[PDB]
């Protein structure tokens, strides 16, 4: 459906087999789903048509809010409360967006597991690799801040991590 982007939430082309009745005996599934169609799907469809025309009579729009970029906690003086406030709000918004990204990837993984059925272990390596990469990055960003987290604590954690990385690289170079 157009209600969501197909690229963000991909699906395989959905190949389905064709009915191959090898016997002439009538299968009750076909007749029963036809009577279901007649007794259920049409009245629901007509009610939806009524509701959709009534909605089309009154059309109005809502907008997705755009947020400007502001200097982050690194370009903030040690006691300048206003810039720290701006940077903290921006960092919290980014944290929420990252959580939503991880949610999207997890939804992809769950859909793959259910869809591929008995061969999910092989036919879901792509989603597993994507989730592993995203999970590793998210953990590196936000794993251990705890309650009372902030942009300053995240910056300190990043500085410690990249100091360790610089030390390791220097040790490798001077090996």
Partner 1 sequence: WIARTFYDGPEKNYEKTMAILQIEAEKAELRLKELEVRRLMRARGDGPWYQYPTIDKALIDHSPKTTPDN
* Binding residues for partner 1 (CB under 8 A): 79, 81-82, 85, 89
Return the number of the residue (46 or 89) whose C-beta is nearest partner 1.
89
Residues 128 and 130: their CA atoms lie apart, in Å, by: 5
135 and 102 Cβ atoms separated by less than 8 Å: yes
127 and 108 Cβ atoms separated by less than 8 Å: yes
Other Cβ atoms less than 10 A from the Cβ of 76: the count is: 20
Return the number of the residue (86 or 98) whose C-beta is nearest partner 1.
86
Residues 160 and 158: their CA atoms lie apart, in Å, by: 5
| Token code pair at residue 16 | 């389905």
Minimum distance of partner 1 from residue 148's CB (angstroms): 18
Return the number of the residue (56 or 81) whose C-beta is nearest partner 1.
81
Residues 10 and 147: their CA atoms lie apart, in Å, by: 35
Return the number of the residue (86 or 116) whose C-beta is nearest partner 1.
86
Minimum distance of partner 1 from residue 86's CB (angstroms): 8
104 and 8 Cβ atoms separated by less than 8 Å: yes
Q: Output DSSP code: residue 40.
A: I
Return the number of the residue (83 or 134) whose C-beta is nearest partner 1.
83
């Amino acid at each position: 459906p157009d209600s969501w982007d197909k690229d963000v939430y991909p699906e395989p082309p959905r190949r389905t087999p064709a009915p191959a009745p090898q016997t002439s005996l009538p299968n009750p599934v076909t007749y029963l789903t036809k009577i279901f169609d007649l007794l259920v799907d049409r009245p629901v469809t007509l009610a939806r048509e009524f509701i959709e025309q009534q909605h089309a009579k009154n059309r109005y729009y809502y907008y997705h809010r755009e947020f400007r970029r502001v200097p982050d906690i690194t370009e903030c003086e040690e006691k300048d409360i206003l810039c720290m406030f701006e940077a903290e709000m921006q960092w919290r918004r980014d944290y929420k967006v990252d959580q939503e990204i991880v949610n999207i990837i997890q939804e992809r993984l769950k859909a793959c597991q259910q869809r591929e059925g008995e061969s999910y272990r092989q036919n879901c390596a792509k989603e597993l690799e994507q989730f592993t990469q995203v999970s590793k990055a998210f953990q590196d960003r936000y794993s251990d801040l705890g309650a009372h987290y902030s942009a300053r604590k995240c910056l300190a954690k990043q500085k410690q991590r990249m100091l360790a990385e610089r030390k390791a690289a220097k040790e490798a170079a001077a090996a």
